[PDB]
């Protein structure tokens, strides 16, 4: 609608803000953004205030009308037909009050949401209007992320605050009025219930502090676990090969033990919070009527149940809404105060020939020296002025000065003509690349085509699939530098400006293209224009008409889930005895809750049957028992639900973690790291923190809903007949709304993000959009994004409002049926039972809506539980230990036989190794050779059985398929291509089983010469490492890998060649260490750098997944037809000469031996 469009709706508030700023200047005081908001929207907040006044009046009138209805029974007389009509009258008014609430909520729900959205949309538009105008100083104080959080976080307070604001007055006032009326019903006793009721607000706030502290404390463990988990998932392939999987299992379980320990305490503490809301009503009424009866008053159905109903009105608003209003309105003023600051940062103050007069400028007046100094120059159309000099000499600052970004400290600049600007860092924004080029000038294909050829983009329009109608991201990330660079030139040309300011734009493209762009675009096409070019191409400099040389700024020259998921989530937590006990505690909580109120109804009726008097020791004693049992089972329920469901989130995490460890490497390939870790972070996070509270709050409310209906059916059993249609209506209605609502809910969630991405993109482009005088066109584009989301949000509002109004309608009908159903059956039932029925029915509205709401949220979050469940079901690698276990001394010799070995990463995948059949003799040194990308390392995956091979692999005649995976994996030793240091201690990275002597560790660390860094580390070997060990170089990590291999003494060594990540001066040193140490080992090495293997005893060549050659390297090189000879020959003549020399020497010596 025209009144809610972003442009119009914000523009008025910008008007009010300017007027407040003008007033504040005249008043010589600071401007207040709150006063600007209030003056703009007070006409809306006043009508919202009236609705709260009316709503709270009817919510207080309802109890007093209920008193009149019950009064019909306390003096019942079947002859008084007049009294029957009068009782029907109040039942009529009670009915109206319930529908008036249903209508007021129906109107109030709409206007409050609109009142909030209007303020949000208006503020966003002002925030953007300001962002386009910030002086370059202010970009130094703020950051794009800090500004974007104004839209993402801080403005999103306001459309919450508009809900609660009027409770800051309606809450206090309603407490007074409800206290005043309770003084009518009860007298002084009302102060007892109110004393408790106010004491709840300090207690609930205090609990909030303990929870916040515990919540803050636990976060450290969570982050510790997730980081450990992330390095686990990332490292899993290497973790598996070292068989360190036991270590991380111990580590994570320790971290998870501690974290759930904190989560249990925090969750119990929060269970006391929800328990309070449950029992609060029952204690308030206990203390009130206990004091009332000690003061000598008799209990009678009218006064008791009118009072009970009045506490229901004030209790919820004083304990729930008003504390929420003080919190959220406080967050409003924090946010408003923050936005007031942003709106008040320094603003740029902009006012054919170009002329410059002798000028000095500071990017910061806090600088001791200028950034441009004494500069004066002039240029006019038909010239090219170059700007030349060192990096940081001021070259780009000159262009900013002609553009007007840098204001003068002295001297002045003046120009006439349209400016064009091209930044050395290109910028491109969400749109078609044609749009990025047209920039919103009128399209002319006939000349645009000339630009597209003139800017040589036509070639790249062949690579763009949709050509120039391919969309480009808001940060250009899908384009390459040379493309987005060429895109900026294409934009600049089409704007067909008069003054071209070019910040070294062509260096992004090759010289031939650059000079093609220079010659056609810069020299010929701009020639009718002013041209100012920073460039380092001296061929262009000499083609320039004149040159300015800069130094130090001075002139040098002017030259849904199924039930099974639910069953699992509870059953996983505890034995079914506790869960059955959980059900009973739940029911016992609710039944004792209702029975407390039934006891007042029973106590009333017994009193009515009556000097003689009732024995308080019986009635008031049992009453105290029913309150106590309500309190006990309310607390126990709360704690016990959190126990079972948090206990379950422990068990499901551990089943999932063991699954992931046991999951084959295929799993970590097919699912990227972040998607796995998302389970352990978001989904486990929901299961621990959010989901158990939501279950507890649902079950708490739901049983009261069933409680309200059950009491009404218990007292007036024919109400069962009116209910069964109403339940079918409810059930059908719920399903239909949940089917259609979920789609519009997502739509609102997606249309929001374009608002923030536009602000982000425009801030990055801030000079170019403002250089092109495009500020207001970008405001139009933001309004387009802004009031696109407004359409989606309105459809969500009306969809939700359509459900809510008729959810209240069936709730209103319920009160009608009880109200008149009581009177139609009046002869059969007695005052206390009507009060019990009606005082409960009056509470159904609100709790019923929240019940349905929380129902949806439970079903929603159960999606995350379902996602962990599947990760408990992942297929597993074969057992870590088979029934057979190898001899304790095996492997004796490390004779490895490949026989028909056939391997694939997946059974459904290609066979990357086939018929692979080779003997590796004990202590034999064998190199593995294969073309890059041949899958050469697939041999490693087969030997460590990361996927089960077909055929037979034997080690000392033990069939590696027929032994436990940890037995096989531990006893070989592997040096990986990329090193990994885990953020344990240095000792952990070397010896996580903690079984090696420290003397061995120091020997290893000496043998790799890394000990110096470990002596530099303060804790010695107990030193903590950095994140990923980043304190060590990538080379030093590879030194550790040697250390690990040195420590893990085994007959069999494998190397994956990438030791050139050590600097050559130490790469070669560890390469020698490998030679010197592992002479005791059978050694395999797979390499690209054939020089590294070349001294092997044999080389295996696998260019295509077959063992094409397996022979002495010299004999291979003597075979001039060998692939290895051809490969070294493909390295080159001197390479082969060097390689053949090495092979000849070692072959001769071994033959001369």
Query: Residue 974 has which token pair?
Result: 């592997």
Question: Based on the domain organization, do 422 and 511 belong to the same domain?
Answer: yes
Q: How far apart are CA 12 and CA 14, in angstroms?
A: 5
My answer on whether omega of the bond before 75 falls inside 30° of 0, hence cis, is: no
Residue 1047 and residue 1008 in contact, taking contact as beta carbons nearer than 8 Å: no
Distance, CA of 1001 to chain centre: 42
Answer yes or no: do 933 and 999 share one domain. yes
Contact 45, 165 (CB under 8 A): yes
- The verdict on 319 and 377 lying in the same domain is no
Quick one: resolution in A?
Answer: 3.3
Are 327 and 341 spatial neighbours (Cβ–Cβ below 8 Å)?
no
Can you give the three-state secondary structure of 177-242, one letter per residue?
HHHHHHHHHCCCCHHHHHHHHHHHHHHHHHHHHHHHHHHHHHHHHHHHHHHHHHHHHHHHHHHHHH
The answer on 626 and 515 residing in a single domain is: no
- The answer as to whether 895 is a domain residue is no
Q: Is residue 897 part of a domain?
A: no
CA distance 238 to 974: 9
| Backbone φ, ψ for residue 5 (5° rounding) | -60, 145
Task: Find where tokens 């109206």 sit.
Answer: 96
Of 61, 63, 82, 83, residue with least CA distance to 72: 83
| Residues 644, 648: Cα–Cα separation, whole Å | 6
Count structural domains, the chain.
Answer: 3
Alpha helices per DSSP H over 1030-1122? 1034-1047, 1064-1077, 1090-1093, 1113-1118
CA-to-CA distance for 304 and 297, rounded, in angstroms? Answer: 11
Please name every residue paired with 532 in a beta bridge, in sequence order, or none if there are none: 385, 501
* 1106, part of any domain: yes
Give the torsion through C-alpha atoms of 620, 624, 625, 629, to 10 deg.
Answer: 150
Cα–chain center distance at 1034 = 31
Q: Is-contact 404 350, C-beta < 8 A?
A: yes
Q: Point out which residues pair with 553 in neighbouring strands.
A: none
Domain extent at residue 1102? 920-947+955-1151
Helix (H) or strand (E) holding 54: helix 33-71
d(CA 840, CA 829): 16
If asked whether residues 55 and 103 sit together in one domain, one would say yes
Looking at the structure, tell me whether residues 302 and 399 fall in a common domain.
no
58 Cβ contact partners less than 8 Å away, ≥ 6 residues apart: 97, 100, 101, 104
**Do 1090 and 1140 belong to one domain?**
yes
CA 134 to chain centre: 30
Q: Is residue 643 in some structural domain?
A: yes
The tokens for 843 are 């509470």
DSSP annotation string for 1106-1144: S--EEE-HHHHHHSTTSHHHHHHHHH-HHHHHHHHHHHH
Q: How many residues does the chain have?
A: 1153
DSSP 410: B
**Is the CB of residue 839 less than 8 Å from the CB of residue 650?**
no
Q: In what order do the strands lie in the sheet with 1109-1111?
A: 972-975, 1052-1056, 1082-1087, 925-929, 1098-1101, 1109-1111
User: Do both 466 and 597 map to the same domain?
Assistant: no
**Looking at the structure, do residues 48 and 155 belong to the same domain, yes or no?**
yes
What experimental approach yielded this model?
A: cryo-EM
Residue 399 sits in a domain of what CATH number?
3.40.50.300
Domain closes at, from 871, 892, 908: 871
Q: Which CATH number covers residue 56?
A: 1.20.1560.10
Residue tagged 């029952």 (tokens): 282
Query: Do both 671 and 749 map to the same domain?
Result: yes
Same domain, 711 and 805: yes
* Torsion sign across C-alpha atoms 988, 990, 993, 998: negative
Query: Concatenated DSSP letters for 136-186?
Result: TTHHHHS-HHHHHHIIIIIGGGHHHHHHHTTHHHHHHHHHHHHHHHHHHHT
Q: Is residue 364 assigned to a domain? A: no
Alpha-carbon gap, residue 1006 to 1001, rounded angstroms: 8
Q: Is residue 363 part of a domain?
A: no
**Is residue 419 within 8 Å of 407, Cβ to Cβ?**
no
In a domain, 719, yes or no: yes
Task: Identify the domain boundary among 844, 871, 898.
Answer: 871
Query: For residue 549, what is the DSSP state?
Result: E
Residue 936 CA to residue 1088 CA, distance in Å, equals 10
365 belongs to a structural domain: no
Query: Tokens 């129906």 — which residue?
Result: 106
CA 1085 from centre of chain: 44
Q: 1042 and 978: one domain?
A: yes
Domain boundary among 851, 871, 891: 871
Q: Return the exposure string of 456-489: e unless at least 16 CB atoms fall within 10 Å of the residue's CB, then b.
A: bbeebbeebeebbebebebbbeebeeebbbbbbb
């Amino acid at each position: 609608l025209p009144e809610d469009r972003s442009q119009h709706l914000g523009e008025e508030l910008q008007g009010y803000w300017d007027q407040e700023v003008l007033r504040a200047e005249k008043d010589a005081r600071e401007p207040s953004l709150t006063k600007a908001i209030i003056k703009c929207y007070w006409k809306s907040y006043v009508v919202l205030g009236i609705f709260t006044l009316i709503e709270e009046s009817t919510r207080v009138v309802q109890p007093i009308i209920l008193g009149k209805i019950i009064g019909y029974f306390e003096n019942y007389d079947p002859s008084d037909s007049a009294a029957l009509y009068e009782a029907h009258g109040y039942a009529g008014v009670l009915s109206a009050c319930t529908l008036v609430l249903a209508i007021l909520h129906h109107l109030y729900f709409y206007h409050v949401q609109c009142a909030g959205m209007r303020l949000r949309v208006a503020m966003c538009h002002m925030i953007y209007r300001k962002a386009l105008r910030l002086s370059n100083s202010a970009m130094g104080k703020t950051t794009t992320g800090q500004i974007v959080n104004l839209l993402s976080n801080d403005v999103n307070k306001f459309d919450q605050v508009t809900i609660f604001l009027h409770f800051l007055w309606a809450g206090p006032l309603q407490a007074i009025v409800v206290t005043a009326l309770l003084w009518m019903e009860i007298g002084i006793s009302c102060l007892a219930g109110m004393a408790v009721l106010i004491i709840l607000l300090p207690l609930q706030s205090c609990i909030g502090k303990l929870f916040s502290s515990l919540r803050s404390k636990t976060a450290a463990f969570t982050d510790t676990r997730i980081r450990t988990m992330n390095e686990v998932i990332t490292g899993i392939r290497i973790i598996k090969m070292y068989a360190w999987e036991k270590s991380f299992a111990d580590l994570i379980t320790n971290l998870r033990r501690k974290e759930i320990s904190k989560i249990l305490r925090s969750s119990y503490l929060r269970g006391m919070n929800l328990a309070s809301f449950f029992v609060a009503s029952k204690i308030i009424v206990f203390v009130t009527f206990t004091t009332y009866v000690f003061l000598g008053n008799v209990i009678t159905a009218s006064r008791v149940f009118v009072a009970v109903s009045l506490y229901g009105a004030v209790r919820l608003t004083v304990t729930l809404f008003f504390p929420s209003a003080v919190e959220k309105v406080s967050e409003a003023f924090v946010s408003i105060r923050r936005i007031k600051n942003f709106l008040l940062l320094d603003e740029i103050t902009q006012l054919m020939i170009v002329n410059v007069q002798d000028f000095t400028a500071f990017w910061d007046k806090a600088s001791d020296t200028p950034t441009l100094q004494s500069l004066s120059f002039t240029v006019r159309p038909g010239e090219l002025l170059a700007v030349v000099g060192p990096v940081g000499a001021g070259k780009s600052s000159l262009l900013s000065a002609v553009l007007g970004e840098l204001p003068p400290n002295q001297g002045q600049v003046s120009v006439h003509g349209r400016i064009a600007y091209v930044s050395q860092q290109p910028w491109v924004f969400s749109g078609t690349v044609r749009s990025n080029i047209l920039f919103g000038k009128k399209y002319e294909k006939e000349r645009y085509e000339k630009v597209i050829k003139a800017c040589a983009l036509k070639k790249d329009l062949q690579l763009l699939e949709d050509g120039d109608l391919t969309m480009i991201g808001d940060r250009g990330t899908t384009l390459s530098g040379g493309q987005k660079a060429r895109v900026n030139l294409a934009r600049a040309v089409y704007q067909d400006a008069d003054i071209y300011l070019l910040d070294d734009p062509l260096s992004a493209v090759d010289a031939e293209v650059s000079r093609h762009l220079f010659e056609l675009c810069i020299c010929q096409a701009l020639h009718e224009k002013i041209r100012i070019l920073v460039t380092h191409q001296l061929q262009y400099l000499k083609a320039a008409s004149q040159i300015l040389i800069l130094k130090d700024g001075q002139m040098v020259q002017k030259g849904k889930v199924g039930f099974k998921a639910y069953k699992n989530y509870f059953t996983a937590g505890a034995h079914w005895f506790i869960i059955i006990f959980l059900i009973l505690v739940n029911l016992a909580a609710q039944v004792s809750y209702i029975l407390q109120d039934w006891w007042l109804s029973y106590w009333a009726n017994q009193q009515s049957a009556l000097t003689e008097k009732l024995d308080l020791n019986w009635y008031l004693g049992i009453y105290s028992g029913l309150t106590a049992s309500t309190v006990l089972f309310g607390i126990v329920r709360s704690l016990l639900v959190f126990f079972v469901l948090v206990s379950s989130s422990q068990t499901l995490h551990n089943q999932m973690f063991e699954s992931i460890l046991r999951a084959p490497v295929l799993f970590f390939d097919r699912n990227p790291i972040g998607r796995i870790l998302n389970r352990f972070s978001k989904d486990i996070g929901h299961m621990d923190d959010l989901l158990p509270l939501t279950y507890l709050d649902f079950i708490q409310t739901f049983l009261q809903v069933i409680g309200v209906v059950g009491v009404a059916v218990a007292v007036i059993p024919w109400i069962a007949i009116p209910l069964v249609p109403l339940g079918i209506v409810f059930f059908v209605l719920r399903r239909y709304f949940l089917e259609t609502s979920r789609d519009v809910k997502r739509l609102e969630s997606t249309t929001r993000s374009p608002v923030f991405s536009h602000l982000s993109s425009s801030l990055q482009g801030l000079w170019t959009i403002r250089a092109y005088k495009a500020e207001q066109r970008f405001q139009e584009l933001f309004d387009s994004h802004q009031d696109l989301h407004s359409e989606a949000w309105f459809l969500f509002l009306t969809t939700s409002r359509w459900f809510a109004v008729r959810l209240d309608a069936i709730c209103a009908v319920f009160v009608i049926v009880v109200a008149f159903g009581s009177l139609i059956l009046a002869k059969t039932l007695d005052a206390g039972q009507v009060g019990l029925a009606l005082s409960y029915a009056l509470t159904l509205m609100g709790m019923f809506q929240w019940c349905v709401r929380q129902s949806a949220e439970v079903e929603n979050m159960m999606i995350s539980v379902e996602r962990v469940i599947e990760y408990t079901d992942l297929e597993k690698e074969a057992p870590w230990e088979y029934q057979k276990r190898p001899l304790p001394s095996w492997p004796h010799e490390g004779v490895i036989i490949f026989d028909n070995v056939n391997f694939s990463y997946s059974l459904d995948g290609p066979l990357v190794l086939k018929h692979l059949t080779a003997l590796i003799k004990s202590k034999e040194k064998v190199g593995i050779v294969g073309r890059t990308g041949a899958g050469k390392s697939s041999l490693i995956a087969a030997l460590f059985r990361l996927s089960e091979p077909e055929g037979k692999i034997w080690i000392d005649k033990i069939l590696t398929t027929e032994i436990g995976l940890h037995d096989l994996r531990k006893k070989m030793s592997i040096i990986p291509q990329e090193p990994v240091l885990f953020t344990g201690t240095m000792r952990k990275n070397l010896d996580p089983f903690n079984e090696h002597s420290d003397e061995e560790l120091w020997n290893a660390l000496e043998e790799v010469q890394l000990k110096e860094a470990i002596e530099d580390l303060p804790g010695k070997m107990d030193t903590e490492l950095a994140e990923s060990g980043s304190n060590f170089s990538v080379g030093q990590r590879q030194l550790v890998c040697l250390a690990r291999a040195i420590l893990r003494k085994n007959r069999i060594l494998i190397i994956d060649e990438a030791t050139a990540n050590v600097d050559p001066r130490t790469d070669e040193l560890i390469q020698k260490k490998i030679r010197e140490k592992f002479a005791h080992c059978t050694v395999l090495t797979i390499a690209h750098r054939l020089n590294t293997i070349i001294d092997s005893d044999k080389i295996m060549v696998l260019d295509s997944g077959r063992l094409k050659e397996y022979d002495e390297p010299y004999v291979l090189l003597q075979n001039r037809d060998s692939l290895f000879y051809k490969m070294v020959q493909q390295l080159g003549k001197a390479e082969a000469a060097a390689l053949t020399e090495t092979a000849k020497q070692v072959y001769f010596k071994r033959n001369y031996p």
